[PDB]
Amino acid sequence: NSQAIDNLRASLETTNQAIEAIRQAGQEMILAVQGVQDYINN
Amino acid sequence: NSQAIDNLRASLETTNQAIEAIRQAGQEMILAVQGVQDYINN
Amino acid sequence: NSQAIDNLRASLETTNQAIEAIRQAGQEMILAVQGVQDYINN
Amino acid sequence: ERLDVGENLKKAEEKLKKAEELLKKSEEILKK
Amino acid sequence: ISLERLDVGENLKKAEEKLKKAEELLKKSEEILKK
Amino acid sequence: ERLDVGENLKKAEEKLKKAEELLKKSEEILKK
């Protein structure tokens, strides 16, 4: 079923995008925590 | 092979569930860090 | 297209590994915020 | 001099809200 | 004075439940693919 | 002495860079 194969490719590409979003959220959380530790210290 | 296509679907549906749990963990870390900022300012 | 099925499998396998790394990131972020809670409380 | 990392948390909240919309899209492609 | 200690433990604990759940769903996805 | 969670935050940075490269490798397999 060539149409099912194309749905799987389109689904997995979009899931790979959702993961890149969650990864960037994670970079923002590290900065937020670092900002908190810098405040307390400095 | 339709078993191979269906096996990919089951695996990808399970992966999307794992990503949603990590995303919701992310939302709890934001609340946690806001909570610390508020303790400090109050 | 049985080649497209083989590429989707190798892709989804690499995607599961990316998500496990992000999940391990989240575990370290949890420790870090506990680190900040304790230092303030303790 | 007041602690503010509000720009990081709001961008993180935007990144996770985007992930959520992309996940619903992925699931609907598989529904199809 | 400070009335209460700092407690964001209810949040950090829901996050721990979430990462543990992700880990079990990832192992399930992996076991499905292998088949 | 200093508050320092620099270890947790550094390891998290490593894990997110490792995730970025894996996702790159995955999108590259899906392209081929």
Helix (H) or strand (E) run with residue B1 in it = none
Q: Which of F19, E2, E35 is CA-nearest to residue A21? A: F19
For residue E31 the two structure tokens come to 């076991």
**Rounded CA gap, C30 and F30, in Å?**
33
Chain B residues in contact with C36 by the CB 8 A cut-off are 36
Longest Cα pair distance anywhere in chain E, in angstroms? 62
Alpha helices in C1-42 (DSSP H): 2-41
Task: List the determination method.
Answer: X-ray
At E26, give phi and psi (nearest 5°): -60, -45
Q: Please, what's the b/e burial string for A3-39 (b: 16 or more CB within 10 A of its CB; e: otherwise)?
A: eebebbbebbbbbbbbbbbbbbbbbbbbbbbbbbbeb
Please report, for residues B12, D3, E29, the alpha-carbon distance to residue A11 in angstroms, rounded to integers and kept in the order given: 8, 41, 15
Give the span between the Cα atoms of E12 and C38, in whole angstroms: 13
Residue F12 has its nearest CB partner, among A12, A20, A30, at A30
Candidates B12, B13, B30; nearest CB to D12: B30
Tokens 């963990």, residue located: B25
Contacts of E6 in chain C (CB under 8 A): 37, 40-41
Resolution (A): 2.2
Amino acid letter, D13: E
Cα distance between residue B29 and residue F30, in whole Å? 32
- Dig out the tokens for A40 from the structure: 């307390």
Structure tokens at C33: 């915020």
